[PDB]
Design a protein around this ligand. Structure first.
Ligand SMILES: O=C(O)c1cc(S(=O)(=O)NCCS)ccc1O
Ligand SMILES: *CC(=O)[C@H](CC(=O)O)NC(=O)CS
Lengths: 92, 146
């Protein structure tokens, strides 16, 4: 038998409890970064390692700018939730 | 055969699998939810990115809570025998554990339960990936200078 919850992965845009940023013209910080890292690395790296690069890209390259001090100068870390049981490569 | 290790998922089935993208941009008035400007940029980027990974991409726009549940139920009832994996991307407003249809919330657990190992037998043992662009709450991260 295997667990019924085995072999799921959740790639969340943000930490539990947190806001998630989206730009009117570029899209969301997370999806833009995810697509970029998949484009660059899906034929090269295991999926958790791609998602780790996505974490770094979102964490380092994005910061909010807002006229409202409440929402200004904010940062985001995505959150990988793996219940996978094997490494995942998009190529073979 | 030589030594066989089972450290990576079998990803050489005839099909990589489905990539369902739910793109919720426009919301009903009484929900009080703003239009998600930029989400189409995300949706196009994802369709192209997963196309190049050989996923069968299906885009769905502005689904109600009922339509989300119906879509996922129907997708989980397909025969995925010849497919390596399953991908679902959710682009919407959200809160912890919740994604918004155009007319109200859906528990993420309700969506993912359809794909449990006991409920979608043709995906048992295969990676099921849920990619979620939505808030998980209202907290803001102030960051720290390095
Ligand atoms: O960096 C951004 O993407 C950004 C985006 C916005 S926004 O007004 O386009 N979206 C925020 C509310 S959905 C405001 C400030 C920002 O720094
Ligand atoms: C709080 C939210 O659920 C949304 C998520 C989204 O991608 O629209 N975030 C915002 O509205 C901040 S841009």
């Amino acid at each position: 038998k295997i667990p019924v919850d085995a072999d799921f992965l959740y790639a969340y845009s943000t930490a539990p409890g947190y806001y998630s940023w989206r730009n009117s013209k570029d899209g969301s910080w997370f999806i833009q970064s995810l697509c970029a890292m998949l484009k660059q690395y899906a034929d090269k790296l295991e999926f958790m390692h791609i998602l780790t690069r996505v974490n770094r890209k979102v964490a380092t390259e994005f910061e909010s700018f807002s006229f409202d001090a409440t929402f200004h100068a904010k940062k985001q870390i995505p959150c990988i939730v793996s219940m996978l049981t094997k490494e995942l490569y998009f190529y073979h | 055969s030589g030594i066989s290790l089972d450290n990576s998922y079998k990803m050489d089935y005839p099909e990589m699998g489905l990539c369902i993208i739910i793109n919720n941009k426009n919301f009903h008035k009484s929900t009080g939810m703003t239009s998600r400007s930029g989400t189409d940029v995300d949706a196009a980027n994802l369709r192209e990115t997963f196309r190049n990974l050989k996923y069968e991409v299906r885009n769905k726009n502005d689904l109600t809570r009922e339509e989300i549940v119906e879509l996922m139920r129907d997708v989980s009832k397909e025969d995925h025998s010849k497919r390596s994996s399953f991908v679902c991307v959710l682009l919407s407003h959200g809160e912890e554990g919740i994604i918004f249809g155009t007319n109200g919330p859906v528990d993420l657990k309700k969506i993912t339960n359809f794909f449990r190992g006991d409920r979608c037998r043709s995906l048992t043992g295969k990676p099921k990936l849920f990619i979620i662009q939505a808030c998980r709450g209202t907290e803001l991260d102030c960051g720290i200078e390095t």
